[PDB]
Tab-separated table of C-alpha atoms in Angstrom:
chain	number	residue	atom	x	y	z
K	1	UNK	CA	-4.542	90.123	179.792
K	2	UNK	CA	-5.801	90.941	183.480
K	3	UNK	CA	-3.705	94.193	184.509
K	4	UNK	CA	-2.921	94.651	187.714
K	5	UNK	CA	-2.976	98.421	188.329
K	6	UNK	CA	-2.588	101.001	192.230
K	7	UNK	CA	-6.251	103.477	191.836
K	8	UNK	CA	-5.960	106.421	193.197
K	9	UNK	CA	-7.744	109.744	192.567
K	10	UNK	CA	-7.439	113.855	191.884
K	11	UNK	CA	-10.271	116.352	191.715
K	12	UNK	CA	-12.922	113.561	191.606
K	13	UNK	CA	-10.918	111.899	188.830
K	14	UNK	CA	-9.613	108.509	189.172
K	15	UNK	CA	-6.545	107.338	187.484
K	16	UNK	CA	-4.378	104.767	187.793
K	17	UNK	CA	-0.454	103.286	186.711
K	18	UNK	CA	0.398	99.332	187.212
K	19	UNK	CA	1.984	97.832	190.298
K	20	UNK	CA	5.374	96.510	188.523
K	21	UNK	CA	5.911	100.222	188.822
K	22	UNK	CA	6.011	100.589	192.549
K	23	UNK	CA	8.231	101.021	195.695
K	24	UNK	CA	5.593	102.275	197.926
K	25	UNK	CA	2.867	104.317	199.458
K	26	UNK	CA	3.073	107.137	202.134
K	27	UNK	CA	1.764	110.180	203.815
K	28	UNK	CA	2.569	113.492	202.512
K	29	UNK	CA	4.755	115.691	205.202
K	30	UNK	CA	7.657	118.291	204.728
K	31	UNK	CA	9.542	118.331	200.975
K	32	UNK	CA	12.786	119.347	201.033
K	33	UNK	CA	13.216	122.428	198.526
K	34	UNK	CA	16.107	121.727	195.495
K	35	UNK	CA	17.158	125.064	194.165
K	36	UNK	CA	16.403	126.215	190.361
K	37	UNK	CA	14.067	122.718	189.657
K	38	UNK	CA	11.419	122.274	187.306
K	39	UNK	CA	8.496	123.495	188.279
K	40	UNK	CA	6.364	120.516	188.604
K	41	UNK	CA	8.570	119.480	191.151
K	42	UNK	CA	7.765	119.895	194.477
K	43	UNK	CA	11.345	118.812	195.909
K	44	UNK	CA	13.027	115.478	197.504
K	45	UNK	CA	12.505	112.822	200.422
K	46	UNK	CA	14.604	110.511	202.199
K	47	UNK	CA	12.673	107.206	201.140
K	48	UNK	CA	14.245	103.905	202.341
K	49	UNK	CA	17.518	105.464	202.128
K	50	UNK	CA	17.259	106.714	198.751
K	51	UNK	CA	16.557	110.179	197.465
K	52	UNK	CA	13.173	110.036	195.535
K	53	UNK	CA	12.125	113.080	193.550
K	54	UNK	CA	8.353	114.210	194.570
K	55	UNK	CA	6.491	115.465	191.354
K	56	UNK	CA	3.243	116.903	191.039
K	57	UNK	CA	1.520	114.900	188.945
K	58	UNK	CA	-1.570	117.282	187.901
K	59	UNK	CA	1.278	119.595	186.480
K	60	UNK	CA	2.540	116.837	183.940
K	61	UNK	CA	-1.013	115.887	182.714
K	62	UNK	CA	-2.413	119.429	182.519
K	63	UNK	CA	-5.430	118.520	184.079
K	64	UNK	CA	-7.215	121.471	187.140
K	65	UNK	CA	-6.021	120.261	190.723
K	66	UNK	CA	-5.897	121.790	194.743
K	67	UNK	CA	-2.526	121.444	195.902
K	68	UNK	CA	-3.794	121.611	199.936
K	69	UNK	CA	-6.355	119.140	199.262
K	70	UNK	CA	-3.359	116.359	198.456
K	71	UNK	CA	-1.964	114.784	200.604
K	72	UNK	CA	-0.567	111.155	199.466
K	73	UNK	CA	2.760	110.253	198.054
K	74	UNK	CA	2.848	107.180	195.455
K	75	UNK	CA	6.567	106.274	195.033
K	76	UNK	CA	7.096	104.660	191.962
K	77	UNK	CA	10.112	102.834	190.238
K	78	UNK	CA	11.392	102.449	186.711
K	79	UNK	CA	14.931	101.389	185.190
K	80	UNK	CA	15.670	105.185	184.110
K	81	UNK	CA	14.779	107.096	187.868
K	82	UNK	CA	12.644	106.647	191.113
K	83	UNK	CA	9.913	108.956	191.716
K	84	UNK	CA	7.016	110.259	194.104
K	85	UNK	CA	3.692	111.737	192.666
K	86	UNK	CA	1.894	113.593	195.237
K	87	UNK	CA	-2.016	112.893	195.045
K	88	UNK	CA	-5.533	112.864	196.753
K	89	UNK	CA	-6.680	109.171	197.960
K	90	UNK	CA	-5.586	105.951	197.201
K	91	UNK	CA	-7.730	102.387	196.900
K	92	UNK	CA	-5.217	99.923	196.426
K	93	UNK	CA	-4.720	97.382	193.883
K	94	UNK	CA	-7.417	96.862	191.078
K	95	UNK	CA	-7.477	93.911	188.669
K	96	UNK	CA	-9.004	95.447	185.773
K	97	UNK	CA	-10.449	93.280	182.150
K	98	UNK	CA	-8.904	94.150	178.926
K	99	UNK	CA	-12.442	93.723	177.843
K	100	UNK	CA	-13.363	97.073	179.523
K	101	UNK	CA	-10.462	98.690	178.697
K	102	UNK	CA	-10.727	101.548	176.119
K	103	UNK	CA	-7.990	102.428	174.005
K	104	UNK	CA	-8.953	106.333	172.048
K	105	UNK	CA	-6.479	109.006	172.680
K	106	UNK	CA	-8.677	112.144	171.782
K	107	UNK	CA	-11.431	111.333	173.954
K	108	UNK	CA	-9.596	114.297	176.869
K	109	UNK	CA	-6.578	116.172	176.430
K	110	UNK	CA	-3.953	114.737	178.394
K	111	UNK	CA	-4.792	110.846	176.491
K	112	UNK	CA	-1.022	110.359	174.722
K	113	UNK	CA	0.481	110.160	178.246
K	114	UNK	CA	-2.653	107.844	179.128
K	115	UNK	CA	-2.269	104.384	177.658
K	116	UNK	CA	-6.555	103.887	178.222
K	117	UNK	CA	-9.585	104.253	179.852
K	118	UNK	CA	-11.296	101.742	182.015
K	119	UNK	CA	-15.206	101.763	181.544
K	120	UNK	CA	-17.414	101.026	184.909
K	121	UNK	CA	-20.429	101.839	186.598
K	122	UNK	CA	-18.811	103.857	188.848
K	123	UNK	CA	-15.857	106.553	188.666
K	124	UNK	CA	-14.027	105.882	185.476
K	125	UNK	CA	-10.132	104.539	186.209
K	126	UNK	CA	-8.069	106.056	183.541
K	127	UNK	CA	-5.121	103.917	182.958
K	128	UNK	CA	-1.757	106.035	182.512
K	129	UNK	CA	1.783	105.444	180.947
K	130	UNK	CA	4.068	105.546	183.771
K	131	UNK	CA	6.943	105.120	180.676
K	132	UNK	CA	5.606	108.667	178.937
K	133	UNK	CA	5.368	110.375	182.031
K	134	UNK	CA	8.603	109.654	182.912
K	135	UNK	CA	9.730	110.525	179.365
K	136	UNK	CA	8.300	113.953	179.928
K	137	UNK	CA	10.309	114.909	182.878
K	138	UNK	CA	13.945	114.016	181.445
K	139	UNK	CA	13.741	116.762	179.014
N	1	UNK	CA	-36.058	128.985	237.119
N	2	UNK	CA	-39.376	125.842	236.575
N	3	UNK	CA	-38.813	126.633	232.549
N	4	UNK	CA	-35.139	126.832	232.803
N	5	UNK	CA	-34.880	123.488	234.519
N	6	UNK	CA	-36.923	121.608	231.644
N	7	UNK	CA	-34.096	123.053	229.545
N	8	UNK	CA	-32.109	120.626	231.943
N	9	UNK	CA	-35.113	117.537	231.653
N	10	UNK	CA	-33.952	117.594	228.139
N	11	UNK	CA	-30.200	117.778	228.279
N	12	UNK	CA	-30.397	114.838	231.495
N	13	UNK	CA	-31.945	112.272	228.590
N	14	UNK	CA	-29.897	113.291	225.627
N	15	UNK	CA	-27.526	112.665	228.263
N	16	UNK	CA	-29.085	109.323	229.682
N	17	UNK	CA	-29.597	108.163	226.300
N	18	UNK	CA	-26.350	109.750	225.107
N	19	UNK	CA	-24.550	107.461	227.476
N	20	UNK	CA	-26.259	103.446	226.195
N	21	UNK	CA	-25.934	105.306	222.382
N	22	UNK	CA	-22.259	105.584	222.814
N	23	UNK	CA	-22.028	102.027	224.594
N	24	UNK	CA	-22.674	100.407	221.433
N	25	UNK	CA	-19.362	101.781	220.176
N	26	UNK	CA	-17.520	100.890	223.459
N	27	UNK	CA	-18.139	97.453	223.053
N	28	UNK	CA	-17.591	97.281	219.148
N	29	UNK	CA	-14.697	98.676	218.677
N	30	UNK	CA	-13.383	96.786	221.626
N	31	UNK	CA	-14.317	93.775	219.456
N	32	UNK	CA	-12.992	94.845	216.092
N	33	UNK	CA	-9.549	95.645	218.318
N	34	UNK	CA	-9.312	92.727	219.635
N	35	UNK	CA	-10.127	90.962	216.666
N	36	UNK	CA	-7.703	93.135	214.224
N	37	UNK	CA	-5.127	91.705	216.987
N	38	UNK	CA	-5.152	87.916	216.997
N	39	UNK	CA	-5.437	88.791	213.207
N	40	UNK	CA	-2.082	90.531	213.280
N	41	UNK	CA	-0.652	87.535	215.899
N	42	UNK	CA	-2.316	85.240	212.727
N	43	UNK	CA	-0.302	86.470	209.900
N	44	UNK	CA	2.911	87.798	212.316
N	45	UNK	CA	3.284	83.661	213.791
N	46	UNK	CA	3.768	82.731	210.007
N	47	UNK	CA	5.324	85.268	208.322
N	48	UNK	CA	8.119	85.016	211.002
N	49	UNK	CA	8.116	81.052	209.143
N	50	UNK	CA	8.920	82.549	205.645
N	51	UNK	CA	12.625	83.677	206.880
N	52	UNK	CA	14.127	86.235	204.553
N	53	UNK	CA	11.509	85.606	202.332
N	54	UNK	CA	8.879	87.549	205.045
N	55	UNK	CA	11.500	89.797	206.080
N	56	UNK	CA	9.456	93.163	205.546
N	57	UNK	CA	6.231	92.002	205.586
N	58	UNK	CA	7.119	90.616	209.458
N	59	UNK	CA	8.179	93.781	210.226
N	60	UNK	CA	4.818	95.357	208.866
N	61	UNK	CA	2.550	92.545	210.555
N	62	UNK	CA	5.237	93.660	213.679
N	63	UNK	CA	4.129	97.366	213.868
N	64	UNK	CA	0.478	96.625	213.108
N	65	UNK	CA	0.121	94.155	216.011
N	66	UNK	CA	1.628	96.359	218.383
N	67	UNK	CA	-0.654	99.355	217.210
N	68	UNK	CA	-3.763	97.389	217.249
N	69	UNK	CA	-2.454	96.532	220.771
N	70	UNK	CA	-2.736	100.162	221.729
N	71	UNK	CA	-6.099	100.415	220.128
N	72	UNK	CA	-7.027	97.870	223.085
N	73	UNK	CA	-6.217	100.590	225.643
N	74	UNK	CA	-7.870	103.826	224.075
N	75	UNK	CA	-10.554	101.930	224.144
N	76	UNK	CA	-10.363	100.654	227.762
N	77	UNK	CA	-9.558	104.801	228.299
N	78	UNK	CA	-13.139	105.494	226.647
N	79	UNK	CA	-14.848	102.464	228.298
N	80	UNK	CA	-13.640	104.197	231.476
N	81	UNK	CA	-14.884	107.638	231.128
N	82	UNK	CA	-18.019	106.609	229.621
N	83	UNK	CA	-18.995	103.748	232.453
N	84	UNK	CA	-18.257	107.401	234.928
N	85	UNK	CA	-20.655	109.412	232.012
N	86	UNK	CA	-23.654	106.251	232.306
N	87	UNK	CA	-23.296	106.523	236.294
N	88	UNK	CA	-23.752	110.607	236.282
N	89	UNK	CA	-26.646	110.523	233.665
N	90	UNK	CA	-28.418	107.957	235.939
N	91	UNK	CA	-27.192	110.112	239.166
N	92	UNK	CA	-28.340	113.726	237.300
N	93	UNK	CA	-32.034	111.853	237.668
N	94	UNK	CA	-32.556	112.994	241.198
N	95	UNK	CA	-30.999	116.891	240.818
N	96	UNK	CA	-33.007	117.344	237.617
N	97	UNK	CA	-36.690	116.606	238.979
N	98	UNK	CA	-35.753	117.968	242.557
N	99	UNK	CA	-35.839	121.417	241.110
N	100	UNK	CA	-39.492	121.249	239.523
N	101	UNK	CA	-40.446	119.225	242.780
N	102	UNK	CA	-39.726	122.093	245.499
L	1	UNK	CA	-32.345	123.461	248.463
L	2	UNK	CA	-32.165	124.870	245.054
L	3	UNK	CA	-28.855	126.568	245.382
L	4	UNK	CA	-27.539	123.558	246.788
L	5	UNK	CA	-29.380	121.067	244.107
L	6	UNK	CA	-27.981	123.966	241.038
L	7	UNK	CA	-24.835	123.938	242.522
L	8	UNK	CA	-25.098	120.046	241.700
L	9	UNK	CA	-26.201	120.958	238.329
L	10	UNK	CA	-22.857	122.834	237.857
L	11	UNK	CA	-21.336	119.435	239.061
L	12	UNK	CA	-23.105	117.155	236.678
L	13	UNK	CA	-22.031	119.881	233.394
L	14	UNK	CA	-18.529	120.468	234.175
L	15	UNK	CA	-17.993	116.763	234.446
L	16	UNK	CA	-19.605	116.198	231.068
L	17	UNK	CA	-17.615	119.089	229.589
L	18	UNK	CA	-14.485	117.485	231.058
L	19	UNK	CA	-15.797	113.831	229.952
L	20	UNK	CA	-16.359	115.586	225.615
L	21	UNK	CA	-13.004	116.444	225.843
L	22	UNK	CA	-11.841	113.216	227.446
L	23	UNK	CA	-13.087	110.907	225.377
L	24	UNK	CA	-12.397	112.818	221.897
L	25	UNK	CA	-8.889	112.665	223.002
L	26	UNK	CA	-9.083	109.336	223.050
L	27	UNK	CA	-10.804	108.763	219.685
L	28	UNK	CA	-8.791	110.938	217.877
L	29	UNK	CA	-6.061	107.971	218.883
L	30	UNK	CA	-8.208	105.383	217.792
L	31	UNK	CA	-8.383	107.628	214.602
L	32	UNK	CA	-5.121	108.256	214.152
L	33	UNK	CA	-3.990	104.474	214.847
L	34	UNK	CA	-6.946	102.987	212.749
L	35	UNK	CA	-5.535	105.261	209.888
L	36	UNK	CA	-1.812	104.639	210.106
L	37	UNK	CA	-3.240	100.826	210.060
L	38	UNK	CA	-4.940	100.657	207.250
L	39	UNK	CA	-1.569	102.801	205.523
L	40	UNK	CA	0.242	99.910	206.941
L	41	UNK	CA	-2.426	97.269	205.857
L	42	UNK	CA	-2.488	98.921	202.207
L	43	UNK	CA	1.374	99.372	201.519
L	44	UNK	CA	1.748	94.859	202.559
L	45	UNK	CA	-1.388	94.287	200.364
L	46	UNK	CA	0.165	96.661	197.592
L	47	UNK	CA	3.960	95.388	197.919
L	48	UNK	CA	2.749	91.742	198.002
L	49	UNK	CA	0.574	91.973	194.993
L	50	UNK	CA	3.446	93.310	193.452
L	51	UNK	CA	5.726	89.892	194.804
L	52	UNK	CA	3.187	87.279	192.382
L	53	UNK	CA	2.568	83.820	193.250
L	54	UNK	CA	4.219	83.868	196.945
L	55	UNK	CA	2.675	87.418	197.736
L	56	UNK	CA	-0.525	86.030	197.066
L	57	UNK	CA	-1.265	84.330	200.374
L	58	UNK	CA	-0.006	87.334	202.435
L	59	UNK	CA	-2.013	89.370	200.205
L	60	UNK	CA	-5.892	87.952	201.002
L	61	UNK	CA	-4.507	88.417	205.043
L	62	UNK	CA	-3.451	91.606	204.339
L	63	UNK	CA	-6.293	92.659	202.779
L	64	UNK	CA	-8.766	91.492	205.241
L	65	UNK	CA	-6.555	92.990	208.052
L	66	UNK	CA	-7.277	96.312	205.753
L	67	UNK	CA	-10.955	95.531	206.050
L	68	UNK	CA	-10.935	95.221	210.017
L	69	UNK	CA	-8.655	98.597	210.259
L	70	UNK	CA	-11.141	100.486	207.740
L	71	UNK	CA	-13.922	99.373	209.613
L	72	UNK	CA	-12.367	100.431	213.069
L	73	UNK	CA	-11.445	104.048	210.907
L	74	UNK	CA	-15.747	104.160	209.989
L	75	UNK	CA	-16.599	103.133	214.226
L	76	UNK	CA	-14.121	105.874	214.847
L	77	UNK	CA	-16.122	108.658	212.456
L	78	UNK	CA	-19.449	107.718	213.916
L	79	UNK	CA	-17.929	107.770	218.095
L	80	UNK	CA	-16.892	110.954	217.222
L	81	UNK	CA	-20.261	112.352	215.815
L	82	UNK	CA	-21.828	111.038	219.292
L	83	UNK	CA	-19.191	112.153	221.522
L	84	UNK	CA	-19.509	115.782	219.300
L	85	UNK	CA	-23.084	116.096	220.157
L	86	UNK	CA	-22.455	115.214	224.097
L	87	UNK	CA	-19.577	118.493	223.850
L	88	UNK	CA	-22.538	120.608	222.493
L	89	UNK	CA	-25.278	119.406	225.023
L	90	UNK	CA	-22.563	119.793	227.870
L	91	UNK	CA	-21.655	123.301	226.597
L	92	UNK	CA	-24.889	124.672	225.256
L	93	UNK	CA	-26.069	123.882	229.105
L	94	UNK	CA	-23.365	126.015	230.793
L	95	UNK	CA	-25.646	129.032	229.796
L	96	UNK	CA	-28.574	127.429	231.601
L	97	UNK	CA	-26.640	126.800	234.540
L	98	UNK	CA	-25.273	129.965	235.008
L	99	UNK	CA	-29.001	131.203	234.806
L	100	UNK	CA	-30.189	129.452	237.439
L	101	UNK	CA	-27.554	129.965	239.713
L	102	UNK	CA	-27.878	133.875	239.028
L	103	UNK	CA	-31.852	133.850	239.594
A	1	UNK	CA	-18.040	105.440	267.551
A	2	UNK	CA	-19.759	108.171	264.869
A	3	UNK	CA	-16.399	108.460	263.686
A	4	UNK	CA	-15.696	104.652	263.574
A	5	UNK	CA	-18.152	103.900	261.279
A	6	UNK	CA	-17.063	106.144	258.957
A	7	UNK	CA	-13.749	104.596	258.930
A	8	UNK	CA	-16.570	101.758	258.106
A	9	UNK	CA	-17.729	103.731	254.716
A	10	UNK	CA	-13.980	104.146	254.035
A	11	UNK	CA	-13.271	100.681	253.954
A	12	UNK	CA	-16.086	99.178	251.678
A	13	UNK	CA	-15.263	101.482	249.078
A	14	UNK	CA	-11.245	100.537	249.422
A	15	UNK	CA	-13.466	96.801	248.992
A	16	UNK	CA	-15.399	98.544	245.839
A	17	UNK	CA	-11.935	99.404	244.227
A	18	UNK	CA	-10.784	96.574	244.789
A	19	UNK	CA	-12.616	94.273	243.646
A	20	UNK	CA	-12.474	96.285	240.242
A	21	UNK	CA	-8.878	96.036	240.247
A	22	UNK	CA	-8.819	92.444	240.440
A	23	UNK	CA	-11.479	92.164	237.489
A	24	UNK	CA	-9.032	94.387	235.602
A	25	UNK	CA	-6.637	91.089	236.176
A	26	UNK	CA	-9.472	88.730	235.555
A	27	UNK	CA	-9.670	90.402	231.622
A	28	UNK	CA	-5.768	90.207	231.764
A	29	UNK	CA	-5.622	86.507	232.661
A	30	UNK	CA	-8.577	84.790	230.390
A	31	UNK	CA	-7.000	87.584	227.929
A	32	UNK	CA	-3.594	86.190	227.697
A	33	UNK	CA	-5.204	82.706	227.878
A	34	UNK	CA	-7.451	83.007	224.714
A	35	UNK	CA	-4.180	84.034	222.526
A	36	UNK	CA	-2.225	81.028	223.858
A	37	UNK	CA	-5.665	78.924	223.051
A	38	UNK	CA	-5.259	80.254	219.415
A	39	UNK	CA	-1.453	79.886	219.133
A	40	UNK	CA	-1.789	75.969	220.381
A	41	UNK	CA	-4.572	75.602	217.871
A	42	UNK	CA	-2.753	77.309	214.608
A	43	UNK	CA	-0.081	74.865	216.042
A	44	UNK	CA	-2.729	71.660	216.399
A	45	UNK	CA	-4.599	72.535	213.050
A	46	UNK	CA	-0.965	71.776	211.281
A	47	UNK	CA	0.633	69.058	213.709
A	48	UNK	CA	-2.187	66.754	213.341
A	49	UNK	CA	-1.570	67.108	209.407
A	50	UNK	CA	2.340	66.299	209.460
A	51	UNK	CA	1.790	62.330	210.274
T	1	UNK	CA	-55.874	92.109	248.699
T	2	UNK	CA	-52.964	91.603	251.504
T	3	UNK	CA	-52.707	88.074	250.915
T	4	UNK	CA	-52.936	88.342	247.580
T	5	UNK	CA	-50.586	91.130	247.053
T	6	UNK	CA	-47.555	88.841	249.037
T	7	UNK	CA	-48.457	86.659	245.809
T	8	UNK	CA	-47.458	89.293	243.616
T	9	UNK	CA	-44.197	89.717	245.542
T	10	UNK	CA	-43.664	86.492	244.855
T	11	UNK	CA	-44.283	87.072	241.209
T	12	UNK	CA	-42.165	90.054	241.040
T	13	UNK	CA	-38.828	88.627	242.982
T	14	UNK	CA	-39.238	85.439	240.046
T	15	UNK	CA	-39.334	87.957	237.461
T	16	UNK	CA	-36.535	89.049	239.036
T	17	UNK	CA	-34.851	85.595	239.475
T	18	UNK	CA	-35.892	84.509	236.020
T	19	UNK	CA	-34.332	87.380	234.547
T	20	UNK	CA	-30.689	86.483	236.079
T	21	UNK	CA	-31.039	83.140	234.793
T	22	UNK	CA	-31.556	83.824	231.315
T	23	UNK	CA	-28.761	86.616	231.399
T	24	UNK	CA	-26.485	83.724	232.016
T	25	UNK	CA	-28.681	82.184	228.927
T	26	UNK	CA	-27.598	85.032	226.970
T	27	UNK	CA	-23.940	85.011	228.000
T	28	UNK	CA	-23.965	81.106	227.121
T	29	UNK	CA	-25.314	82.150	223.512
T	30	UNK	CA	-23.151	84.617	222.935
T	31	UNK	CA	-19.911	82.590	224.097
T	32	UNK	CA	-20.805	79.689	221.598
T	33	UNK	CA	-21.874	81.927	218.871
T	34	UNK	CA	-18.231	84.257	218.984
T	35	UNK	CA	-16.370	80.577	219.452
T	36	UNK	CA	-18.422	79.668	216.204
T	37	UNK	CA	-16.917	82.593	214.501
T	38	UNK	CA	-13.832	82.296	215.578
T	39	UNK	CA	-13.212	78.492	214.506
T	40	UNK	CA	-14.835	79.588	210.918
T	41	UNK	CA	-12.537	82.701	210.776
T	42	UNK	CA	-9.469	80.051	211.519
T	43	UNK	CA	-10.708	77.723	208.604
T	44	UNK	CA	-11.745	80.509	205.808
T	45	UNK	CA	-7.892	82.523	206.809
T	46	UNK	CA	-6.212	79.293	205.074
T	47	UNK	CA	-9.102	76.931	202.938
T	48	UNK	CA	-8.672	80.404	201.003
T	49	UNK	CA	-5.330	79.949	200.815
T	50	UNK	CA	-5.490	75.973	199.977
T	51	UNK	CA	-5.732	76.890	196.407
């Protein structure tokens, strides 16, 4: 199968979660504060009339981040909720070979939540589960 | 005040050469603008023909004409003040080796 | 003649320290439009990817309207470097001209 | 007439300006007339294909 | 030397001449060359999309 997945990057890290997940992508400006939330949560926006949740990302997986140096919003969309995951830059949409694609869970920490890891010649993609991640915040 | 004028020699052609240096960019990005336009006019006069179909992606192609229509005129703005820089850096010859002259 | 010819001097740097400032106002617009562009560029080619077989076409435009706008944001970091060095060379002057005008 | 002709200097660079104002419409014009080119060709590159 | 220096005046006002005939040369070039690129852009923006 040729996946279709949005790159985008933190802390010199790429990563990546497919495009049947989607709403959107925007700039990063004021989040409106929600009182006693979770605290990877950074608080709500007013996206295309909807209230969309923005997490932080880097606080579900575990992995070191820079909160100032963020500054992108991907809004994403499953059947359960729709939700924001602040970031650092974004590519755009990579078509990626299951030949490449890498499927050990022990190889770094945060590789349950990760459904692989896409091998390259330049910064590796590592391919997420947008389903697990949301299954981490509902509880 | 002979020593502190070739301080001046040397700021008159980073400034002479500082002016056809940032003439290059002038008339590219005038280009790419103008290109990046009848681009947007490209996709907007046919994704106005895919009805509700195009809906947002005509209102995208919209807002992306009209800023790469404004990119046009910041450009015209810099080809402006930089035609007035090129015509200073040529008129700074004379008041530059007028000095070291008397 | 060379009060007259540095007073000159002071006219040829204060229009060049007027004309850094001028112009970088300027390209941080053509920044800050080529930027917004390519967001604008990115979020069609990402939503019609998403569409399938009828996004596709929309998608290559898209795409190479992305390429134009992220080639005008990489004109628009290398303008900026010039018109950064014509600010210093305009400013770093000032202390020349007020030299010569004192002596 | 020492004053006359500089009413003289006055008026050819009213003629300098312009002339650069109607160049400024010159651009406008063949502008304007290279989009409607490409709009009667996108247009022409599909009419002559619909028989 | 007098006579033969109104020969290089001569010389230099067709260098001169010379020079503003192939600027219009260069004009001509570059007219037919962004035309050229313009009528490939308008076939490779939909042969691409002609499956």
């Amino acid at each position: 199968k040729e996946f279709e997945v949005l790159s985008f990057e933190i802390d010199e890290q790429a990563l990546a979660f497919d495009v049947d997940n989607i709403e959107m992508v925007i700039e990063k400006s004021d989040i409106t504060p929600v009182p006693k939330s979770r605290h990877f949560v950074e608080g709500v926006i007013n996206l295309r009339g909807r209230i969309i949740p923005v997490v932080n990302l880097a606080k579900i997986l575990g992995i070191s981040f820079d909160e100032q140096k963020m500054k992108s919003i991907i809004v994403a969309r499953t059947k359960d909720v729709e939700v924001g995951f602040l970031v650092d830059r974004v590519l755009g949409v990579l078509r990626i070979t299951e030949n490449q694609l890498d499927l050990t869970n022990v190889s770094d920490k945060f590789g349950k939540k990760s459904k692989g890891l896409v091998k390259t010649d330049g910064r590796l993609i590592i391919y997420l589960d947008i389903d697990k991640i949301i299954e981490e915040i509902t509880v | 005040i002979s020593n502190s004028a070739k301080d001046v020699e040397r700021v008159v052609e980073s400034f002479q050469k500082g002016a056809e240096e940032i003439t290059s960019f002038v008339e590219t990005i005038n280009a790419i603008a103008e290109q990046t336009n009848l681009l947007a006019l490209n996709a907007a006069i046919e994704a106005a023909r895919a009805g509700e179909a195009g809906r947002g992606f005509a209102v995208v192609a919209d807002e992306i004409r009209k800023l790469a229509e404004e990119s046009q005129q910041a450009s015209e703005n810099v080809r402006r003040v930089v035609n007035e820089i090129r015509s200073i850096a040529e008129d700074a010859g004379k008041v530059s080796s007028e000095i070291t002259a008397r | 003649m060379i009060s007259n010819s540095a007073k000159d001097v002071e006219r040829v740097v204060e229009s060049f320290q007027k004309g850094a400032e001028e112009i970088t106002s300027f390209v941080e617009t053509i920044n800050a439009i080529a930027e917004q562009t390519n967001l604008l560029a990115l979020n069609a080619a990402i939503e019609a990817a998403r569409a399938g077989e009828a996004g596709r076409g929309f998608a290559v435009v898209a795409d190479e309207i992305r390429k134009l706008a992220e080639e005008s944001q990489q004109a628009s970091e290398n303008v900026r470097r010039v018109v950064n060095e014509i600010r210093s060379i305009a400013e770093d002057a000032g202390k020349v001209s007020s030299e010569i005008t004192a002596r």
